Design an enzyme around this catalytic site. Structure first.
Site, PDB file in Angstrom:
ATOM      1  N   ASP A  12       0.823  -1.202   0.000  1.00 56.35           N
ATOM      2  CA  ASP A  12       0.000   0.000   0.000  1.00 56.35           C
ATOM      3  C   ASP A  12       0.859   1.254   0.000  1.00 56.35           C
ATOM      4  O   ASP A  12       0.633   2.180  -0.788  1.00 56.35           O
ATOM      5  CB  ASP A  12      -0.943  -0.006   1.202  1.00 56.35           C
ATOM      6  CG  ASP A  12      -1.922  -1.167   1.167  1.00 56.35           C
ATOM      7  OD1 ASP A  12      -1.681  -2.125   0.402  1.00 56.35           O
ATOM      8  OD2 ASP A  12      -2.928  -1.127   1.907  1.00 56.35           O
ATOM      9  N   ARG A  93       5.983   4.144  18.316  1.00 53.65           N
ATOM     10  CA  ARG A  93       5.345   5.235  17.559  1.00 53.65           C
ATOM     11  C   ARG A  93       5.969   6.615  17.827  1.00 53.65           C
ATOM     12  O   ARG A  93       6.263   7.342  16.868  1.00 53.65           O
ATOM     13  CB  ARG A  93       3.830   5.269  17.823  1.00 53.65           C
ATOM     14  CG  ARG A  93       3.007   4.352  16.920  1.00 53.65           C
ATOM     15  CD  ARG A  93       3.561   2.933  16.879  1.00 53.65           C
ATOM     16  NE  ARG A  93       2.710   2.021  16.118  1.00 53.65           N
ATOM     17  CZ  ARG A  93       3.076   0.798  15.745  1.00 53.65           C
ATOM     18  NH1 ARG A  93       4.282   0.339  16.061  1.00 53.65           N
ATOM     19  NH2 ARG A  93       2.237   0.031  15.057  1.00 53.65           N
ATOM     20  N   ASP A 122      -3.101   3.763  16.405  1.00 53.02           N
ATOM     21  CA  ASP A 122      -1.874   4.289  15.821  1.00 53.02           C
ATOM     22  C   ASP A 122      -2.076   5.670  15.214  1.00 53.02           C
ATOM     23  O   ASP A 122      -1.172   6.493  15.282  1.00 53.02           O
ATOM     24  CB  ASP A 122      -1.303   3.320  14.787  1.00 53.02           C
ATOM     25  CG  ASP A 122      -0.528   2.183  15.437  1.00 53.02           C
ATOM     26  OD1 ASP A 122      -0.167   2.317  16.633  1.00 53.02           O
ATOM     27  OD2 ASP A 122      -0.278   1.165  14.763  1.00 53.02           O
ATOM     28  N   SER A 173      -2.259 -10.259   9.598  1.00 53.24           N
ATOM     29  CA  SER A 173      -1.654  -8.936   9.563  1.00 53.24           C
ATOM     30  C   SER A 173      -0.703  -8.829  10.756  1.00 53.24           C
ATOM     31  O   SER A 173      -1.149  -8.869  11.907  1.00 53.24           O
ATOM     32  CB  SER A 173      -2.726  -7.849   9.615  1.00 53.24           C
ATOM     33  OG  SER A 173      -2.157  -6.561   9.745  1.00 53.24           O
TER      34      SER A 173
HETATM   35 CL   LIG Z   1       6.285  -1.091  20.035  1.00 53.78          CL
END
Ligand SMILES: [Cl-]
Ligand SMILES: [Cl-]
Ligand SMILES: [Cl-]
Ligand SMILES: [Cl-]
Lengths: 396, 389, 396, 389
Positions: A12, A93, A122, A173
C-alpha cells in the site's frame, strides 16, 4: 517541498509514494527504520522505495535507541496495559514520529503522511506526536481520509506500471519489532475462537522443553537491565537474549480483550517474551528495593504511565513529569532476580541486591532477631482507632 | 466472666487453656472453625479442648460462609496484594473475629485471646476487628505480650515434634514459612508444596476449563452449576494438578518490614484471572481504569486489617454496582503452572464485532476520527508549543 | 555524651534541662531556632538555658532556610490539609529535626529529647525524623513517657532553686512562626463554641478596612514567589509582606476539625494570611501554565504530599520522589497573579504570564478566532462512544 | 417525524423553528424548561414558539427535580471543578437531555436539535447524553454544523439589541461571558454581577446562618425545615446579599483550550462548604482522604459530559454509602464575600471530646503512642538507612 513518510516495504505504502506524488505534485522521501522487525534486508526495502518513485530513500538503524529510550522507560514503569500486555505497538510510535520530523527538517519536508486507519490507536500516536513536535507540518492520512485501499493501490500500480508484489495477502496482519509482535486475523475477531499454532512466531509452544526449564538471572542497575547470568549486556541485548530464552519456553503469549482509545473493545494476540521477563523481574526487584508506601503509590503511576503511552500521549507534560518521578524511584533499583522460564510461565525463585530493604534480622525468629515486639500492641491500638470510633458510631 | 479463644487442637493453645485458667482464674471457651483446613477431625479437636480444661468447646462449619462472604468479595475486587497473591491468610481473619465475638455473647465472654506474634499481620487483623465489633471485650495476646511459647507450654504441662514448616491453610489457599526461605537467594524445594503438583507431572494433559460468573459471582464450571465453595474446591484440584497458583513473594508487612512468603492458591488464581478477563469484556473503559485503582485499595485495606473500616465498606457499595453486568464465561488452559485465556462469551458483552471488524458488516464511522484526534491532542500540543518556544 | 534538646524558653523545657541532667547524669545542650516566632529576643532565650543549667546554649537563625526549603515546597504542592489549612505546625518539624541532629554531631550528643505528648502529631514528626536521619541517637520523650508535667516541673524548680517564671499560664497555648500561628484553648474543644477576638493575633478582624481593600500582584518564577507589586523579594520577604497585607484584611483565619494521625478528630484554630495568599496565587498560576490532564493528576499529588508531611513523613521516599515530580511541573510556573485582599477573603481578578497556555485566539469568537470547530462533532462522537455502548447494553 | 428542541424564547432559536421547518420539511416541537432562570413568563415563551411555527410547545417545571436529583448529588460530592466552581452550566444539561428525549417519545420525534457551538463544553454534555439515552435519535446542531447565527436568523426572517454579555443562569448559579474579560489582565466590573451584591453593601450586618443536613441532603436553615430547592434559594439570597460565591476562574475545557469564566453561585458555595465541614465531623480519616479523590473524579466526569457514564453511576453508589451518617448542623458567618465556619453539631459525630481533651475526663491512652510511632516510621526509616549507607 517534500512529503515525508514512514516506509516498511509493503504494497500500500509503496504505491502511495507515486500516488502521493501525483496527488500533491510533491516529491516523496521514504524513511525506513530498523527496530528489529527482521524480514527483508533494509537495503532491499530502501531500494524498493526508489524503484517506486521516491526522490530519497533512507534507512535509520534505531534498534539501540528504541531499547534505551523507549523500552527501558516501559520497563521502569512496569508498563502493562489492562494489566495484561506491555504496550506492544505503542512504544515505537513516538520514536518513529521523532525520526520523521527529523527527516522533514533535513530533506525540506512540509508534509508527513501515515497509513493508519480511523478505528485504530496508531492514528492517535502518530498525529498527536506530529502536533506536539512539529505543528507546522501538514499531516496526510491517505487510508483514513482519502479512501486509500489495497484495491485502489493495485489499480493505480497497474495503470502506472509500478514494480510491486501484488500477490494475495496471507490471512495474518503482523506488526513486530524487537520488543514484541502483534497478530491480527479475521478468525480471532470472534471471542469464542481460540488461536491456532500458525498465529505464533516469536515463541515456541509452551509444551516444549518438558525436562529442560531455563533458570535465568537478570540484573539491573538503577532500573536498567545490565546483566544476564552474570554477563554484561546492553538493553537491546537483554531484550534479544530474553526474547530467545523466553520464547523457547513459550513465555509471553498474550490473548487480550482491550479498550481502544477510540471507544471500542477489540481482541488482540501478542508475543512479548523478553518484555514480560524484564517487566516481571523489574517488578520483583522493586519489591526488594522500594519502601512500602512508595511502592503502593508507584503502582498508581505505573498504571497512569501505561495509559498515557497507550493513548498517544508519550509527549504529554503529565507523561514527562511522571518520568522525573520514575527516575528518582529508580535510584536504588539495583540487584539480581532469578526466575525459571518454563511452560509459558515465569516463576521467580531468587533475589539479591546491594540496595536491599529486606532485613533478615528484623524478619527472622532465629537467634539474630532484632524486631522489638513491644511496639506492636500500641501500634495496632492507634492504627485501628479511627475505624473503631466510626464502628462505635455505626453500631450506636 | 469467661475467656474465648480460637482453637485448632495445637499443642501451644491446648496448654494455654489451662495456663489462662490458672493465671486469670477464669473459665475458657474454645471455638474451632472449619474453613477447609483439613487436618484432624473437628470432633477430636473439640474433645481435646474439653480434656484440657475448657468449660465449653464448640465447632462451627463456616466453609460456605467463608466462600460466599469473604472469598467472593476478594474475587470481585480481583484482590492481589503486591499484584502477586490473593490475600491468603488475610481473608479468614475477619470471619474468625465475628465468630469469636458471637461466641463471647453466647457464653458470657468478657475476654478474647489470640496467639498472634508481634511482628506479623494477623495481630492487626484480629485486634482491629475486635476493637471495631466489640470494644467492650478485653483482648489477651499471650504469645506477643506474655511470652507464651512451645517451651513455656511444655514446661507448664502429648508432644509432637516441631515441624521445620509453619503452615497456615484453608480452602482459599496455603501459606508456608520455613527458616531456609528467609534467605532470598534460596529457592523452594518440592517439600514446601501440598495443594499443587509440579507443573511437569501432568504436562502431557493440559486442562481446558470454562468458568462462568453471574453478577461477578462464580456459578459454573464447564457448564455445571456450582456454589462458590464448590468452585474454589474444583479449581483448587484442577489448577493444583497443573501446578497453577504457586507464588513466591517478597511482601511489605503493615508493621514496617519486608518478608519472603510462599503461597499455594490454585483455585483463587484461576477465579481472579477469569473474573478480570470477564470485566475486560463487560466493563466500559474508564470504569475499568478507575476500578483497577479501587481493586488495589481494597486489597491494601484487607491486608492492613481494615476489613471492617468504613472505606472498605463504602468500596463494597461501589463494587456491587460494577458487578451488575459481570456475567459470562471465560475459557482457559491450565498447564505448565500457567493460566492461559483463550475464549470469552457473555450475554452482557460490550464487545461489538461490527464496530471492530473491517469485514462487510463494519459499522465504525471513521469520519469522526480526524476531529477526535485533533481535539484529544490539543491541550498537550499547546503545552508542547510553549515548551519549544 | 550530651543530651540535645530544642528550646524556646518556656517553663517545662527550662526545668527539663536540669531534670534531664539529674535523671541521665549527662550534660544538656539547648538549641534555640529562630523561625520568625517573635516574642522574646533570641539572646534572652539563649541565656535562660544557661541559667537553667545547659552546658551549651545555641541560637540558629533559620528563617531564610525555613522559607526557602520548607515553605516554598508547601507552596509548590498547594499544600492544604483537609483542603483547609496549610500545614501550620507541620512544616518546621523536619527542619528542627535536621538542626537537632546537626547539633548532636557537633556537640557530642548521643541523646535527643523532645516535649511532645502522646496524643499529638508532633511526636510523630519529630521521632520519625530522628529514626530516619540518625537512628543511632536515643530519643527521650519526658512528657509522654516520663509523666513530665507543669506541676512536676514547678516542684522540681522549687526544690532546686531554678530561676524560672512560674506565673499562671494564660488560657491559650500558642505555636507560631513566620508561616502561621496555631491556637489551643479549652473553650474551643467544644464544637458549638465560636472563637472570640482574643484568640487572634496575626490577623485583624475581617470587618476592618471597609473602604480600603488591598489589591496585590504576586509574581512567581518556576513556582517560587519572587515579586510583589513589581518589587523583587526573597521567599521569606514574600511571606512576611503577605502576612502583613493579608493580616490587615483578616485573611487566613481558619477554624478546622481535622483528622490527627493518631486516630482522633480535633478542633483547631489557625492564622495563616501570607501562606493562604501564596498558595491561592500559586494555584491560579498553575491554572494558567499547566496543561489540563497534568493539572488533574497534580491535584492528586498535591493532596498526597500534604498527607505525607502531616503524617510525619517529610523524609519518606514517597515524599522525596513526589518532589522530583513537582520540580518538573514547576519549570514553567512563571507569571503574576493579581488578587484583592478584603473582608477575610482572597479574590483573584488578574493573571499574566510569559509561559501562558491560555490562547486568546483559540478561545475568542472575535475576528482573530483560530479554533477549528469542524473537529468537534467527531471528537464528541468518539469521546462518548464507550459510555454509549455501555448504556445500550444496560438498556437492552 | 418531528424535530425536538429546547426553547427559551430567544431570537436565534425562534427563527430556527421556521428554518428547520423549511430545510428538513419536518414539524418542530419546542420544549421550555423552568430551572429557575427567571426572565420571561413561561407561557409567553410557550406562545412565541407556536407563533413561530412550532406544531407543539410545552412547558416543564423542573425546578424541584433539578434541585433534588442534580444539585444534591453535586453537593454530596462537594463538586468544585478546578477546585474553584460548582459545575455551573454543567448540572442542568443531563436533565434537559432527559426531558428532550421524553418529549421525543411523546410527540413522534426522530430528531433532536441543540444550539451549542463547536468550542464549548455544552455540545459534549448534550450529545453524549443523547448517544447514551436515545442513540436512535438524529442530532442536529445548526449553530456548530450549519452556520446558524443571529445574522442568518435575522436575514431568514422582533429583534432586540445584542448584549455585550452572554449569560447562562438558573437556580444553581449564573455564568457570564463578555469580550472584555477574554483578556486575563482585565478585572470584572460591577455590571457583570446580578445574583450577588458587592461585599461592601451589607458589610455592617454579617449574617450568621446554620445549615442542617440529613444523610448528606440539606434539610434545614436556622432550624427551619426546607426542601433542597428552598435551601438553594434561601442561601442564594443570604449569600448573595453578602457578596458570597463570586468566582473568577481560568478553566480547562474538555475540547482542549483554557478559558476565563465569571460565575455567581452563592447558595451552591454555602451548601458545598457546609457539606464538606459536616463530612469532616462525620467521616473517618481514611474514608475522607479517599473521598477527596472520588469528589474530584465525579466533578471531572460531570464536567466532561459523562453524567450518564458507568463510572459516574458507580461512584454514586459509593457516595450514597458515605452519606449514610452525614447528618448534623454547620454554623457559618457570611460577610465580605467570604464564608467563615464557626460551629458544628451532629448526632452522628466522630469527634470525641474526652479523647481530644487534656481536662479531667481525658480518655486517651498515651502509652500506645511510642510503639505506634516506632512502627509507623519503620519502613521509611529502613529506606533512609539504605539511602545513607
Ligand atoms: Cl512497540
Ligand atoms: Cl484466608
Ligand atoms: Cl510550621
Ligand atoms: Cl447548571
Amino acid at each position: 517541498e517534500r512529503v515525508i513518510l514512514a516506509y516498511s516495504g509493503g504494497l500500500d505504502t509503496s504505491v502511495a509514494i507515486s500516488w502521493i506524488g501525483k496527488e500533491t505534485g510533491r516529491e516523496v522521501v521514504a524513511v525506513a527504520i530498523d527496530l528489529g522487525q527482521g524480514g527483508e534486508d533494509m537495503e532491499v526495502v530502501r531500494q524498493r522505495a526508489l524503484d517506486c518513485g521516491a526522490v530519497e530513500s533512507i534507512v535509520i538503524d534505531a534498534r539501540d535507541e528504541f531499547a534505551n529510550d523507549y523500552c527501558v522507560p516501559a520497563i521502569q514503569s512496569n508498563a502493562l496495559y489492562m494489566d495484561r500486555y506491555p504496550l506492544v505497538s505503542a512504544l515505537s510510535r513516538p520514536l518513529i514520529v521523532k525520526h520523521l520530523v527529523k527527516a522533514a527538517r533535513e530533506h525540506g519536508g512540509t508534509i508527513v503522511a501515515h497509513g493508519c486507519t480511523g478505528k485504530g490507536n496508531d492514528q492517535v500516536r502518530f498525529e498527536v506526536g506530529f502536533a506536539s513536535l512539529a505543528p507546522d507540518l501538514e499531516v496526510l492520512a491517505p487510508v483514513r481520509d482519502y479512501a486509500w485501499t489495497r484495491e485502489k493501490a493495485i489499480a493505480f500500480a497497474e495503470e502506472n506500471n509500478i514494480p510491486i508484489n501484488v500477490t494475495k495477502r496471507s490471512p495474518f496482519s503482523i506488526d513486530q519489532n524487537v520488543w514484541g509482535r502483534a497478530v491480527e486475523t479475521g478468525f480471532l475477531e470472534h471471542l469464542w475462537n481460540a488461536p491456532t499454532k500458525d498465529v505464533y512466531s516469536y515463541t515456541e509452544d509452551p509444551t516444549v522443553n518438558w525436562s529442560t526449564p531455563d533458570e535465568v538471572i537478570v540484573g539491573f542497575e538503577q532500573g536498567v537491565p545490565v546483566s544476564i547470568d552474570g554477563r554484561s549486556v546492553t538493553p537491546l541485548q537483554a531484550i534479544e537474549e530474553l526474547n530467545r530464552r523466553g520464547g523457547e519456553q513459550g513465555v509471553g503469549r498474550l490473548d487480550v480483550v482491550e479498550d481502544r482509545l477510540v471507544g471500542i473493545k477489540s481482541r488482540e494476540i501478542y508475543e512479548a517474551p523478553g518484555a514480560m521477563v524484564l517487566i516481571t523481574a523489574h517488578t520483583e526487584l522493586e519489591h526488594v528495593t522500594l519502601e512500602r508506601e512508595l511502592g503502593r503509590f508507584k503502582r498508581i503511576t505505573d498504571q497512569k504511565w501505561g495509559e498515557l503511552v497507550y493513548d498517544g500521549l508519550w509527549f504529554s507534560p503529565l507523561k514527562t513529569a511522571l518520568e522525573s518521578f520514575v527516575a528518582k524511584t529508580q535510584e536504588h533499583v539495583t540487584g539480581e532476580i532469578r526466575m525459571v522460564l518454563h511452560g509459558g510461565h515465569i516463576a521467580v525463585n531468587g533475589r539479591r541486591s546491594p540496595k536491599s530493604l529486606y532485613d533478615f534480622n528484623l524478619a527472622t525468629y532465629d537467634e539474630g532477631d532484632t524486631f522489638d515486639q513491644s511496639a506492636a500492641k500500641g501500634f495496632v491500638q492507634i492504627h485501628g482507632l479511627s475505624s473503631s470510633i466510626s464502628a462505635r458510631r455505626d453500631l450506636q
